[PDB]
DNA sequence: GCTGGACATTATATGTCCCGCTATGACAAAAAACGTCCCGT
DNA sequence: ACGGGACGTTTTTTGTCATAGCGGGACATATAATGTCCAGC
């Protein structure tokens, strides 16, 4: 099969280009259906008339249905996306790129989707799709999944679907949250979408450690913290440090600490410098950096060209993590 | 008859109002005939122009004769008035029931919808509808609305619609919540449904007072607590005490306190005995019982036959509150 | 309740008119959803702007949902149609009309829907709705339902829904059919819509009796004929004789017989004169006129002003049948 | 590889054609280099203008050198041609398989789709797709298409689309049917899907020949039978004999006849032995085996490994038929 | 014996715009309701 | 005293339409593919 694909790349690149453009149309319909030719052509970079030619082809092949409210995929369309998913990435050049990103960073594996999410918002949804598919490959019979609360993890929640294998799924918020995109919100949304269950907490924000210790000393609370300690999976974002610290209600004393110690990246309530060393921790009830070592599966979902530096810094140390990212970030990092 | 009227009010919301007004006109004519439009309007406190239109309508229906010396009933009018004497007490067993519930309980007003929500789940939605309509009549130009997190208040949130008058609406959670129906969830849902804004908090549960005091001492937190203190409206549920205490993670020491002091009702984090005296408070960051005095508008939404005793106990003291309830609770309380 | 309704008809006829117009909007949405204000206003006799006022009211009462593809009923809308169904007919004047139609014709009962299906095509769908509801009230634990193949029975099939009581339902074609609206087609469509089962036959048309007798003598065939003989219900149309005979491939000899014997009505393969006496039978394998006597439930579904004479003639003899018809036919017959 | 190619053909229907044509150009250059565009076009029977475009493309892909004295392969070209020698027999195991199936069976042509429909249900839909495309290539200006009623022909009907050339299409049922998948049902569904017209009949089943003769003697009936006799196309299935005879209501006398005469295959109401000789005919009004000779286009659609023996037996005699089948059947037959 | 260049014809894709559908708002105008208030009978 | 008439004001409903997105459709034009033919080196 690899021999066939390599021969096709030399003898039929003109045909491979048409196929990729038509495959991209099917992916964007899967994301946004039902959608009409005006909105879909605008969403891609192409004229209504060019799209209308391609969509009429796809309808004739019974891959899309065209109704008064727009276009949706047929069963054959959904099947085709699953069958061609991996080989299409070989010609998109993502395969070689993922190999190299894994040589460069401390990564268990790299999953890169097309595009730059800083330019093309829907790319966050494709990272979401990819992350969900990755989660499902790693689930055991029973699972406790800890999640953070940022907008990329929200995109993972939005793309979550029930598990075909019906494995047991309990979701909890490792980050606790700061303000509606708080880990509790995400945790619940992801569980509803997966037909799983979930457990919840309070918003930590920034407070005296003694106040957190009293919450930690509490029983019904302790039960949720022990569940978080037992997490089998962590799904988290990676942010720019300054962006995260200004978005939160960071005390002026801690802003100065964060700046003076040259923080560049943020993940699950910690700020790290360019060498991936912790420089500040926003105290929260729940997961600690030392706890990630014992979690079998960690999936970081983060992309966009603006995050290349943060992503590089975070993975300057081994994290035993699979990264789901996009070309925006990966190409900027690697060239 | 109750079922028919409840269906008819969906198409004709002030059906009972028109019925009652026309019935009163016919009663007053039977008492004073012949009487003219000037005397009849004055006696009923209706504008002459409105009364003149209604009696001209009744004359077209052959119920009243309009002659040189004024108005008298027809044969048809006397017969109809005799039929309405029987029906209309059954037609208006409600304005009668609400009048009596307000004589019995400490209530600013009573709003009672048909049915028993313990038997007929959709009755919770009609309490919701009624509560929303009540809220909108009480809004000022600017509003801070504090809400609790129980399933009946959830029903109020589900029926919330944007304000026709576009008054300013900020929602906050007075109860803070305990576990997905936490006041924060409700508060947000209600704000989205109203196209208002909202502010949020952490879940208190049961914890040491000192831990809460540290959260109270905090700044970005203090701002939300001060907003709650400035509430112009409170919308809250009323629960059975034992049900509420067992649903929560109540400490065994506090369960014994609650039982030993004969708590029967619960509202906004307080348990009260049969005389409406506080017997226990689940400590929470936010509203205190003493704070309700200063809130201009308080609406309690609670019904079902199982809550009759709790509702009676809660209103054994003046609360300056409008109660939205159902026949389930009201009829069980009053007979 | 009857006292309340009679008082409402005298005191509130202006309010009853508004309610009926809004109820008619809900009925036509149930039939055609999703539908938009341009198509729905045209379907009724009213301007887009008048409809838009009423539909905005219905949305505010949570009886309809308005989406990009048009309007549908909410749960509350479907419920309201079931609760008000019978009382709305009292003011539509259908109750008095049905009483009189049953005094005039040989009828077990009369069910009359509004309108004239000759003028307003959707009236055939409301006869369909009414017939289905009637069938479901008469089902026993086990049912064999024989059906004819005309366009009004097709409308019954289109409105068929699964039985809430999950009674056993087997459908068969009593008429056998003549040409795509053949009883076999209807029989199958009705069974699929009811989640029942069905058995089938060949199209008789017009042929020598001996050819039919050979088909009757056959075994796998005999089993279906015996099933038809065991029918617990018959659902059939009533047609004008000349229309039915010309639509079919009637032999010229039989056309002359039909004309010369003054046939005026047709039902299940028989032509009858003005006194309801058989004058000609299109020979078919299956049900015979003598067999209807032994069928517990017979429902005739037929309407439109053009059928008044045929309907009157058919019921000049006792048929122990419930007629589902429309005002078109009923008012023309009775005045 | 089979799965990848089948997916790729949905986006690029003549992928294998382009592949093969480019492979042949490279083979012919390796044999004759240096060779010019006039000689190479002549030798391959391709127009000089088309060949010139393909070799200019191959030169841009660095596979061929175009010099004053003509064209030679590059290093890359020799390597690619060596890879394609291995792949392309696996890439084109099909045009090879169809060639061989046509050497083995009595076939006008063979069309084989990937997979085994006994294992993979969707393979019946791809046979359907292929059969429709074949039908459309054979249509004349006016067409009478006779069809049988089995589940594979149903799959052909489901994939039917209107004719791009808008040729005239009338469909009729050659098989008449036995029980909802009766030829009449299929015939109608196919006509609706093609925007054609159709004519229909009764279900023959098994009956005395004299009863059929009376139906044959009839006029409006005779017109449909004469239309079937005028068929320009027949589209039929092929079944296992025992399966077909047990599915129908076969008389015990005829089952014994079918068994005792070693029937193995069934098509259009006839059972045949392993040598393709008729051993029993289920009498039906319509097409007879002798009639197929006069039909210009016959397309048999049948596949799955369980039908290999039936398919082989049916085509032991010349039928002037194009077979649409799958690898399931073809590979089992040929190895 | 070939390179590229090229001209006339035929086929396919594209641009443009189009009519007939669905939702939100939005301004103007007409009708209805109403608050007093006039007279004669 | 009481009803009919009525005028000015206020409130509510209606008419007209306005546009983005949804489709299948039509007409015109451009771009490309194709079928040969051109020269000299």
Numbering used by the authors:
A (entry chain C), B (entry chain A), C (entry chain B), D (entry chain D): 1 to 179, 183 to 338
Paper text:
A typical SorC protein comprises an N-terminal DNA-binding domain (DBD) of a helix–turn–helix (HTH) motif, along with a C-terminal Rossmann-like fold effector-binding domain (EBD). SorC repressors generally form tetramers as they bind to their operators located in promoter regions of regulated genes.
The C2 symmetry was clearly apparent also in the reconstructed map refined without enforcing any symmetry, and the final 3D reconstruction using 220146 particles was therefore refined with C2 symmetry to a resolution of 4.3 Å (statistics in Table 2). Each monomer of CggR contains an N-terminal two-β-stranded wHTH motif with an extension of a C-terminal helix followed by a C-terminal effector-binding domain that shares great homology with other members of the SorC family. The dimerization is mediated through DNA-binding domains, predominantly through a swap of the N-terminal α1 helices. Two CggR dimers come together to form a tetrameric assembly via an interaction between the EBDs of the two neighboring dimers. The interaction of CggR with DNA is mediated by DBD dimers, each interacting with one half-operator, wedging into two consecutive major grooves. The conformation of the operator DNA is significantly affected by CggR binding and exhibits a profound bend in the regions contacted by DBD dimers. Another noteworthy feature of the bound DNA is the apparent kink in the middle of the DNA duplex, where the central minor groove, flanked by the DBD dimers, is substantially widened.
